[PDB]
Amino acid sequence: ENGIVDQVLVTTNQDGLKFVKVRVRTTKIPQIGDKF
Amino acid sequence: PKDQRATTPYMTKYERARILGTRALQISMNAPVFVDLEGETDPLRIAMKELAEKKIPLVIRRYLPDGSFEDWSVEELIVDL
Amino acid sequence: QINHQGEEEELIALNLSEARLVIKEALVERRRAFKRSETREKELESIDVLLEQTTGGNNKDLKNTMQYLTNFSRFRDQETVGAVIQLLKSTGLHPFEVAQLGSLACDTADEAKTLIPSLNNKISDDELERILKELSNLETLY
Amino acid sequence: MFFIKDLSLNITLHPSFFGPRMKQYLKTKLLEEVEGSCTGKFGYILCVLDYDNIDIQRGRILPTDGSAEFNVKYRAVVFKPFKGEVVDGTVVSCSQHGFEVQVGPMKVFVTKHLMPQDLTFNAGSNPPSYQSSEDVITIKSRIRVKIEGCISQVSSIHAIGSIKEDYLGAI
Amino acid sequence: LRFGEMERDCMIAHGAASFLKERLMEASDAFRVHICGICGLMTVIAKLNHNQFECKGCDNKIDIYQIHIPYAAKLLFQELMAMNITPRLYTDRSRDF
Amino acid sequence: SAPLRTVKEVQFGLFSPEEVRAISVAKIRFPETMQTRAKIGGLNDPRLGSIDRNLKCQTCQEGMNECPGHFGHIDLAKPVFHVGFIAKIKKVCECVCMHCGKLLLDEHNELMRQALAIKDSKKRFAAIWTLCKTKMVCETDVPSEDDPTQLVSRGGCGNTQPTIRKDGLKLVGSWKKLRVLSTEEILNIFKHISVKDFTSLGFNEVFSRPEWMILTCLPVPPPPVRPSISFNESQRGEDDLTFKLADILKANISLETLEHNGAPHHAIEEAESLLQFHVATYMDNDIAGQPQALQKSGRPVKSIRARLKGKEGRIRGNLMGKRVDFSARTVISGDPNLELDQVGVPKSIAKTLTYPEVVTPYNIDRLTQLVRNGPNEHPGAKYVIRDSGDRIDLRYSKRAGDIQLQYGWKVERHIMDNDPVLFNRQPSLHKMSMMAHRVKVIPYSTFRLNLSVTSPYNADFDGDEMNLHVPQSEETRAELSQLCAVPLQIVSPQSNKPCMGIVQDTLCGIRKLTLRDTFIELDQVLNMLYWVPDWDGVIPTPAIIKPKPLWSGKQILSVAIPNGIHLQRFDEGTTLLSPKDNGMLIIDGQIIFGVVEKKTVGSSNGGLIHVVTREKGPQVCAKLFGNIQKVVNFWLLHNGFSTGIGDTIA
Amino acid sequence: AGRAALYKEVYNVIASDGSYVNYRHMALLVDVMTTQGGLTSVTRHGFNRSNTGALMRCSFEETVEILFEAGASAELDDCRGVSENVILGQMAPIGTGAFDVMIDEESLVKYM
Amino acid sequence: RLVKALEDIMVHYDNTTRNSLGNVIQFIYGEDGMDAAHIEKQSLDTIGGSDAAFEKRYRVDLLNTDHTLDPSLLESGSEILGDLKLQVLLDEEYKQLVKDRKFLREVFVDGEANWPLPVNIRRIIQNAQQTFHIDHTKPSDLTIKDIVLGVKDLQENLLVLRGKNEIIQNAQRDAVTLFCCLLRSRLATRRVLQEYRLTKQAFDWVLSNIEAQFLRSVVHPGEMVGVLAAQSIGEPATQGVPRLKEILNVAKNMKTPSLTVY
DNA sequence: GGAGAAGGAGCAGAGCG
DNA sequence: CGCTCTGCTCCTTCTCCTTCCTCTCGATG
RNA sequence: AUCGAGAGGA
Ligand SMILES: [Mg+2]
Ligand SMILES: [Zn+2]
Ligand SMILES: [Zn+2]
Ligand SMILES: [Zn+2]
């Protein structure tokens, strides 16, 4: 993987357990072999 | 039964390949070389050169179906490949 | 037995004395290879010289073995060793049984019967009687 | 006792020594590995008869590496004992319970269960020989021992030297 | 990557015995074991620091050989032993000539 | 250390229970595997295949790296049937005299004498079984065939035999006058059968004795066969076998417990069946009947048979085929500028796959530099191995510039140019789908092949993937280059035709290039020649001289073809003038007639490709393909070719 | 006669698709199916029920059912098969392994 | 499934085909011990054509006018004409070819005259013409004696087998029966003089070459023929077909049994 | 579900009484 | 010719049986 | 981690 952190989400379920969701984004630059 | 060997005098390709690979292996082990060096660091190239002019000291043991076998010195064999 | 030459060689029940003499010859051959690269006291020292001129002295145990084998020698002198061979073989004597009589001392036929139970049952006394005293005199010559 | 037999040994050689000198080097290696050998089938191996005429019988090069095997045939002089045999041995070491005697290239242990009941250990002698009966046995003397079976071990081979007999006794 | 059946078939076709062996032995599953000559079962106590070996049930201390086999193969036999099967491996062909 | 050998023959048979007991180094008594980290002496003890960091393995130390496990011992309270042998036991018992130790029939009946004559033991047993199974009585006196009035007092029992029925895990004997047979009875019966009977029955007295079909003790495979499981936070959930063994042990203790405590005859029976059940499912959790052992999780218990039988089992999934290292897989692409026996490999791949090259006086200087470059550069190596086995990792050390190489040391050299490698396109339908090429490293992430090599691979650049394998020993390297090399397969034994050729654009160009009207200005000819790597530096004389120096296309193309070639193809219209310029005729590496097309550079056996392979050898034919493609492509690039809707409009 | 008819019959199938296969590859298959004195199919009930080494047979479609038989008859595989040596991880006796390489020491001492 | 059937089938150094058990399947691989990689389709001239045409193309008579050898063909003209000794040699060959004609009529009942055979004679011959630009306008130095002996001598050197015993020697004769018929077809003296005006030097080269090429083309021992045969049938199958399945599985209950009564 | 093995059941003929 | 015998035929059971990789997803001891 | 199931390529 290679990217930068986009949006870090911290929440909890109904049970009070702490949740963490992290979105990492990157730019796909058409390479040799990429299908079309 | 060296007298009247019933197998070909020609070297079958499998023997060519295996002999070349082996001799390359011994050469890589710093074993004594039997020909002059023209700069072929490639042990396998040394091997083909060696085989071409018959200085391999190897004899092929060919196994017949019954388990009996014949011995063919590489010098005896005809390199037709 | 059979050698690795494909030849069914007979089981060579080698006599102690003839074994020592064959070992002497083999050591002489070994010393020949290195170069190309009798009383029991006389033979004991002579072989030790061969051992020291063919090895480095590490094999002390055998040097003891030959020295002790030479001490219990019965027929040190080979051309006499041949004589007993002809005497014993003329009777069709069994090679394994042959070894003991050539390697062990015995004066009378009965004594051999006592020493070797195998002879006790099937051997002819006359053969032992004539042979053993002939060999006893030969042994006394040593 | 002593036997001449055309025996063979399997020897492996590293490629670097595959020069024509390999014949003599292999001759050596066989000589070291053959002589001074104990074995249940043949007992002990004294020497190699016909030190020349080395039966190399072609080298078996392995596919794993450049190492090759050599089942080199050879005539050797070996020692083989048998049960109930007579040998005029010599006492190598003494013991309160008997003796250990040299029987060819083999070691034989005299056991007190099997010597004349009237013979007793005399610690007063030097060496502490047995002197209570006719069969006086000491390190410096001569002894005949009856081979009451060969007790072959993993590391060495030895047998029982029995003395309680009209023959195969002291000296 | 799984060198599957169809792949080794080609190597058989090409006859690349040396290569086929390398792909199945050196590439993975390399494993050394010791075996008893009396019984062909991997039941050898290998006191390597002592160079001492033995096959309990045969008390054999001289018939010990080193063999290189696929680690998976070792599992198969050991499972066969668990199956009440005796996969005895012998290194000397019964037929001579 | 110990002598090395190789496997020659494998002998199969059944364990002798005393042999099992002797082999085992520990008896198993406790179904319990555990107080916090110590193992019960009666199960999973260090005497077995001890767990990591425990250097016991029955005083074998070495961890689990150089030491396998060892088998345990379980003493069955009662004998039990072996599942795979239930039918075999059934048939055998149908043949024995049922508490006599003898066979129902004898050699005095000619029918068995015919059966006994059978060399094949398997057929022999079946032949006898067909006869004995019909013999429901073992009368002592049997009239002799030679003397009908004389009878042979053979049958010891002299009684009748019951019909045997396979009642699930147990046999039932229907007496012609009915009861459940006893495992003990059968065991004794087998123990009273003679060796001479084994020969007729197809049993080996020293490897396969019929009584051994019945199990009296169970070997206990060590942990390595049922590995300790730590998939979760130190949660065991041991393999099914570990739990399955516990079930047997729990059953074994209970059956023993019941018998000892009060001898509740009936309760003993159910337990014995439970034992026969658990052992049966343990060996095979799949039977013709309903019974299906289930793990506490609710899923079926995975028995030994499940481990082996079926695709992905221990046989097909790990022995005939397996995962391997020193390999790679990616997507391919075309590149005419590469020869048939070549391939493009990304710098990234070569930077990872390595070869264990051996240091010698002939390359120590080169290898020295590679180590200096280290694993970060392409032309370098990852590991330096001393003769002692010191696998130095250049990744985590500055010693790359300090280590002094020594002869005999191994270096994990990166893949470099001209290193033979093996390719494979899944599925490997037939021989051609795997061939050996040469490596040229390139700066992008894909595999480049010469266009022509695709046809045998059945490949296509629409996103197809293809596998790469690298040999590790000099032995194999030589093997591939001489057996699996690309050129060696140009003529396929599939149909006696060349399997390769010019395809796609390059084929189209040649038609135009060799077309009668195609003439080339001097400017182009100068370049086209130079593209031919084999060009000798001698400009051919232009066909047209006076009005303007021109070369007909055929002239240039002939340059690529080596000298000494002679092809003669005649069509219906070929009459040494070819008014349609059909047919084909090449003389001494020079085109004269015809328009070069599919039937001369294609797959056809009469084509040029087939001829060249035989007059010069593949090592020369391979160089041809590059020459043709390099030339035509260059001309086509400067000529161009397209299609469009107009092409379809009439 | 059946062998010939079988070959002729299969030829129609291969030819019907427009593909072409050498006679050598085709005849061999036809021969193998009849060497046992009968039309031995190549299913589980044909080729499998041969007298070849069990360790080879166990990998076709049935594994445990065959192993059990080996123990019953105490089978002794010869290891002459290819797959058998594959399982053991030993060099198969084929191709480059269909012979042996030996060092002709006599020739070695011939070359100084 | 097919591969499993033929894994262990391989060719031994005795030029035979044995399975793992050593059971012999084909005594000589493919009934000719010939590699599939070294064989290509070629014509059999002696099969087709009318009998008179056949005689014209091959028959030579030094005594009569119908099949007179044209003196301009060779440096020796009338020296050859009338020589009964040479006529006998021609008679033997012509009779030999006649047997081949009627013989091959039986082998290939359909009369087809194009079959795979090793060593492409035509290409060797054409190569011969281009080796040193044979001047095809001058008489050659060849003699009938040389041609007839050359043909026979070549045949004696087509050694597929090595066993000196009668049994092996008999097999060798049957192994190359078809191939040697082709040689006697395309090396007939009449053609060797008219169609291909070779020199003595050239003709010696051709015979030497054919033998040399032929030996290279014999199937090598150690081949894993069964695997090659298995795959070779396979890739056809991945392109009728249910029938193939119906064949490999014997399946007595054929879907469409039928008869062809003549 | 097919396909093949398997085992039983009936049955008629062939020899016997 | 009935009896008996035996193979012969028939007639249900009663199994066991099908290229390579890439990700995600929910539930388990 | 496995198993199970699914989606998608070659
Ligand atoms: Mg595609
Ligand atoms: Zn053992
Ligand atoms: Zn262990
Ligand atoms: Zn009975």
CSV table of C-alpha atoms in Angstrom, one decimal, chain C:
chain,number,residue,atom,x,y,z
C,1,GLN,CA,33.5,-67.7,0.0
C,2,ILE,CA,33.5,-65.5,-3.1
C,3,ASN,CA,35.7,-62.6,-4.1
C,4,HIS,CA,34.4,-59.4,-5.7
C,5,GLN,CA,36.0,-60.6,-9.0
C,6,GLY,CA,33.0,-62.9,-9.6
C,7,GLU,CA,35.2,-65.9,-8.6
C,8,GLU,CA,33.9,-68.3,-5.9
C,9,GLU,CA,37.1,-68.4,-3.9
C,10,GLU,CA,37.2,-71.0,-1.1
C,11,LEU,CA,36.9,-69.8,2.4
C,12,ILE,CA,40.5,-69.0,3.3
C,13,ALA,CA,41.0,-70.3,6.8
C,14,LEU,CA,44.4,-68.7,7.2
C,15,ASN,CA,46.8,-70.2,9.7
C,16,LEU,CA,48.2,-67.9,12.4
C,17,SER,CA,51.7,-68.4,11.3
C,18,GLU,CA,51.0,-68.3,7.6
C,19,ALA,CA,48.7,-65.3,8.3
C,20,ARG,CA,51.7,-63.6,9.9
C,21,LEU,CA,53.9,-64.4,6.9
C,22,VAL,CA,51.3,-63.2,4.5
C,23,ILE,CA,51.1,-60.0,6.5
C,24,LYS,CA,54.9,-59.7,6.3
C,25,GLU,CA,54.7,-60.0,2.5
C,26,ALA,CA,51.8,-57.4,2.4
C,27,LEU,CA,53.8,-55.0,4.5
C,28,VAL,CA,56.7,-55.4,2.2
C,29,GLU,CA,54.4,-54.6,-0.7
C,30,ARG,CA,53.1,-51.6,1.1
C,31,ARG,CA,56.7,-50.4,1.7
C,32,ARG,CA,57.3,-51.0,-2.0
C,33,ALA,CA,54.4,-48.7,-2.8
C,34,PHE,CA,55.7,-46.1,-0.4
C,35,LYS,CA,59.2,-46.3,-2.1
C,36,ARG,CA,57.6,-45.9,-5.5
C,37,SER,CA,55.6,-42.9,-4.3
C,38,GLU,CA,63.3,-67.0,11.3
C,39,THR,CA,63.2,-66.5,15.1
C,40,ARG,CA,60.2,-64.9,16.7
C,41,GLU,CA,62.5,-62.1,18.1
C,42,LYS,CA,63.9,-61.5,14.6
C,43,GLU,CA,60.4,-61.4,13.0
C,44,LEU,CA,58.9,-59.4,15.8
C,45,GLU,CA,61.5,-56.6,15.3
C,46,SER,CA,61.6,-56.9,11.5
C,47,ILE,CA,57.8,-56.4,11.2
C,48,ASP,CA,57.9,-53.5,13.7
C,49,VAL,CA,60.4,-51.8,11.4
C,50,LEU,CA,57.9,-52.4,8.5
C,51,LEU,CA,55.1,-51.0,10.6
C,52,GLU,CA,57.1,-47.9,11.6
C,53,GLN,CA,58.3,-47.3,8.0
C,54,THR,CA,54.7,-47.6,6.6
C,55,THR,CA,52.7,-45.9,9.4
C,56,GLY,CA,53.1,-43.0,11.9
C,57,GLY,CA,53.0,-45.1,15.1
C,58,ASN,CA,49.4,-44.3,15.9
C,59,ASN,CA,48.3,-47.9,15.5
C,60,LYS,CA,49.9,-49.1,18.7
C,61,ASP,CA,47.2,-51.7,19.2
C,62,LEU,CA,48.1,-53.8,16.2
C,63,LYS,CA,51.8,-53.4,16.8
C,64,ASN,CA,51.0,-55.1,20.1
C,65,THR,CA,48.8,-57.6,18.2
C,66,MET,CA,51.6,-58.6,15.7
C,67,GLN,CA,54.2,-58.7,18.5
C,68,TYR,CA,52.0,-61.0,20.5
C,69,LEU,CA,51.1,-63.1,17.4
C,70,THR,CA,54.8,-63.5,16.6
C,71,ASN,CA,55.4,-64.7,20.2
C,72,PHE,CA,52.9,-67.5,19.8
C,73,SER,CA,54.3,-68.4,16.4
C,74,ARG,CA,54.6,-72.1,15.5
C,75,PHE,CA,55.9,-72.0,11.9
C,76,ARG,CA,57.7,-68.7,11.4
C,77,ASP,CA,59.7,-70.1,8.5
C,78,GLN,CA,57.6,-70.1,5.3
C,79,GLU,CA,59.1,-73.0,3.3
C,80,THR,CA,58.3,-75.2,6.3
C,81,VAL,CA,54.8,-73.6,6.4
C,82,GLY,CA,54.4,-75.1,2.9
C,83,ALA,CA,55.2,-78.6,4.2
C,84,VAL,CA,52.4,-78.6,6.7
C,85,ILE,CA,50.0,-77.3,4.1
C,86,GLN,CA,50.8,-80.3,1.8
C,87,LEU,CA,50.5,-82.7,4.7
C,88,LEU,CA,47.1,-81.3,5.8
C,89,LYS,CA,45.7,-80.9,2.3
C,90,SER,CA,46.6,-84.4,1.2
C,91,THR,CA,44.0,-85.7,3.6
C,92,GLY,CA,41.2,-83.5,2.3
C,93,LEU,CA,41.1,-81.7,5.6
C,94,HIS,CA,38.4,-79.0,6.1
C,95,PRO,CA,39.9,-75.5,5.7
C,96,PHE,CA,38.4,-74.1,8.8
C,97,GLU,CA,39.5,-77.2,10.8
C,98,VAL,CA,42.9,-76.8,9.0
C,99,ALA,CA,43.6,-73.4,10.6
C,100,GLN,CA,43.5,-74.6,14.2
C,101,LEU,CA,46.1,-77.4,13.8
C,102,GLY,CA,48.4,-75.1,11.9
C,103,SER,CA,47.9,-72.3,14.5
C,104,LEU,CA,47.8,-74.4,17.7
C,105,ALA,CA,50.3,-76.8,19.1
C,106,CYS,CA,49.5,-80.5,19.5
C,107,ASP,CA,51.7,-83.6,19.9
C,108,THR,CA,49.4,-86.6,19.8
C,109,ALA,CA,46.2,-87.5,17.9
C,110,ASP,CA,44.2,-87.7,21.1
C,111,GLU,CA,45.3,-84.3,22.3
C,112,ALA,CA,43.9,-82.8,19.1
C,113,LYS,CA,40.7,-84.7,19.7
C,114,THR,CA,40.5,-83.2,23.1
C,115,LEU,CA,41.4,-79.7,21.9
C,116,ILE,CA,39.1,-79.8,18.9
C,117,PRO,CA,35.8,-81.7,19.4
C,118,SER,CA,35.1,-81.7,15.7
C,119,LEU,CA,38.0,-84.1,15.1
C,120,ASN,CA,36.8,-86.3,18.0
C,121,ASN,CA,33.9,-87.9,15.9
C,122,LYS,CA,35.1,-88.5,12.3
C,123,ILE,CA,38.9,-88.1,12.0
C,124,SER,CA,41.3,-91.0,11.5
C,125,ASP,CA,43.8,-91.6,14.3
C,126,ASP,CA,46.5,-92.8,11.9
C,127,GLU,CA,46.6,-89.5,10.0
C,128,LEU,CA,46.9,-87.5,13.2
C,129,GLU,CA,49.5,-89.9,14.6
C,130,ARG,CA,51.9,-89.8,11.7
C,131,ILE,CA,51.4,-86.2,10.9
C,132,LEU,CA,51.4,-84.7,14.4
C,133,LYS,CA,54.7,-86.1,15.5
C,134,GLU,CA,56.2,-85.0,12.2
C,135,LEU,CA,54.9,-81.5,12.9
C,136,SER,CA,55.9,-81.7,16.5
C,137,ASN,CA,59.5,-82.3,15.4
C,138,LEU,CA,59.2,-79.4,13.0
C,139,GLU,CA,57.9,-77.2,15.8
C,140,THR,CA,60.7,-78.3,18.1
C,141,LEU,CA,63.2,-77.0,15.5
C,142,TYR,CA,62.1,-73.5,16.3
